[model samples]
Target: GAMAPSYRVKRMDIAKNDEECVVNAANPRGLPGDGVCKAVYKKWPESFKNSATPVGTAKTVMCGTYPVIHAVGPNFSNYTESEGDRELAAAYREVAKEVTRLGVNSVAIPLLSTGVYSGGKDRLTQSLNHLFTAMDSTDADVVIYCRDKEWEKKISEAIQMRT
Candidate 1:
């Protein structure tokens, strides 16, 4: 079918999705904070009822219609450590592993660190490259969702060049 194990990019808002599992790049800002979490709150109100107290780094929470895999990398927002490629890679790998265990057939993920972590353009490209192989290897249909058309263009170009 169309929802086989594969990876690709799309220029669409993730909140519009109902069927596919969504991934939240949960940061130290806490639950329903800025970036992805903020948007998720607007779309999925039940997420609050489903999720426990949000943690700083590396936690997965399945809430309501959205089985959100909260992949938190190194704490950058007023925290001590920095989020390099290694930390970001671990976050992506964990999402893939957890999603497989949960048997989610369709998944959507934003390239981490590119969001509230403020990784800039260079960091965004690097972070996407770090997660590309693992995202490609997921056992479900994966959509590397971009926040806007600009990000869609940048991510699409990066994926093409990486392949």
Candidate 2:
């Protein structure tokens, strides 16, 4: 199936989600900045580590109750369209691999590369497509968390279109 049995889109704050693990669209260096990383950092500062996780790869950190997967997605501002799409797909694949490695049952992921990373609307759509594809390979129940109502609607629509 294109959509996993455990997959669903949710309108919620990623930092406060109840999943067993949550993915952070982290910068390659794993420093806390704006968006989801900053929010998650505020909740569990000690869990964050300064490490160089390159684009298209991910690393994990223990954040109290649940593990946080710091997935370094491409900064679209720095790449051509083809490069951005390929790297973004790679990033999601890495996140799915990390989820399988950890053997977590539930995971929450936000739209990667779509905020300060400058992925825009086209990449936002691409992110959803790639995320669903990558996550279908994993057994974990996946939640696509969207903080905004419009984004939530868009994501929901995208999922419906695919299914």
Candidate 3:
């Protein structure tokens, strides 16, 4: 009648942001397939990029004997800059719908496009912030994990607090 104990955030620390006093344990670079999966699978060379997981596959992944890595994406900047924000929103929206189509209630996320992918955090933050802000608890609980504390705190704390 309850969720398993394995299904919880186990973020790994890398470094701290230059300005903020907070630390970035949930860096997007090593998220989902990389850290969550590798760490979950208890394997070395935690490279989510090369990990054997499908993208947009519309399937749930198991982390440490529990469901994790709800959904993931990269290369959001491939589209035109003008429509980038909308496109990103649409992507997450679709993913949200897909996740809801399943039976799950909560989904974890990483910075869609902040490091080694899109131009920077500006567009990614805009898109994700817009999408998540409009989200209601009735739809599906969303948990966004960030590696950089300052960036995560800055955005999440804008309305309230972030963990």
Candidate 4:
């Protein structure tokens, strides 16, 4: 059966050697050192660096290097305001747009709202769901990775939109 070309879901793979930018990291103030971010970049030096999606607090010397965009969504913060939520939405929207903009045949991402911003799994799921829905409609392929099986299920459910 002839079918559309696509990538599989819920997988982990190292970026290719020939890749100019192995992975993208959203850094706040270009400080690639601090918490897990320092460890991540220390492990992968070939990755690209991007600024955080504007979560508001900006309290960390270093937080997470996950490549977040300030383009869409609300301001990702523990105390997300109504308008901030809009900024956060823009953040996710920016991410979706960025992946498409990169002309990447596909792009992979981590849970954007689970850690430093807020520990709400449901909220994270909601954001990922929206982002992927937009991304899925595009010409590019997108893979959002969750660090655990539970989160994976949640994300998969998000994609399903009805679980």
lDDT of 2 at 43: 73
Instruction: Put down candidate 4 lDDT per residue, 1-163, tens digits, no spaces.
Output: 1034243346343222222112232444445543334444565533324434343222111123323222213324544446545544555555655655555555554544445444443566555654655555555555554446776776666556642
Off by more than 4 A, model 4: 1-25, 33-36, 43-79, 119-122, 161-163
Clashing pairs in 3: 24-147, 26-146, 26-147, 27-147
TM per candidate = 0.77, 0.90, 0.52, 0.61
Among all candidates shown, the one with the greatest lDDT: 2
Which candidate ranks first by TM-score, i.e. highest? 2
C-alpha root-mean-square deviation, candidate 1 = 3.3
RMSD list, candidates in order: 3.3, 2.7, 8.5, 6.7
On a 0 to 1 TM-score scale, where does candidate 3 land against the true structure?
Answer: 0.52
lDDT value, candidate 1, whole model: 0.65
Model 2, 1-163: lDDT tens digits are: 1234566888867887878888988888768778887887787676676535889888888866578888888888898889988889999999988899888888989989888886454556888888988987787878888777888888878777766
Q: Write the per-residue lDDT of candidate 3 for residues 34-95, one digit (tens) a residue.
A: 43333333432232333333332223333333333333344444645655555445545545
| Backbone clash count for every predicted candidate, in the order shown | 0, 0, 4, 16
Off by over 4 Å in 1: 1-4, 49-58, 75-83, 119-121, 161-163
Better of 3 and 4 by TM-score: 4
Compute the lDDT of residue 144 as modeled in candidate 4.
59
**Model 3 misplacement above 4 A:** 1-77, 161-163
Model 1: what TM-score? 0.77
User: 61 in model 3: Cα distance from truth in Å?
Assistant: 5.9
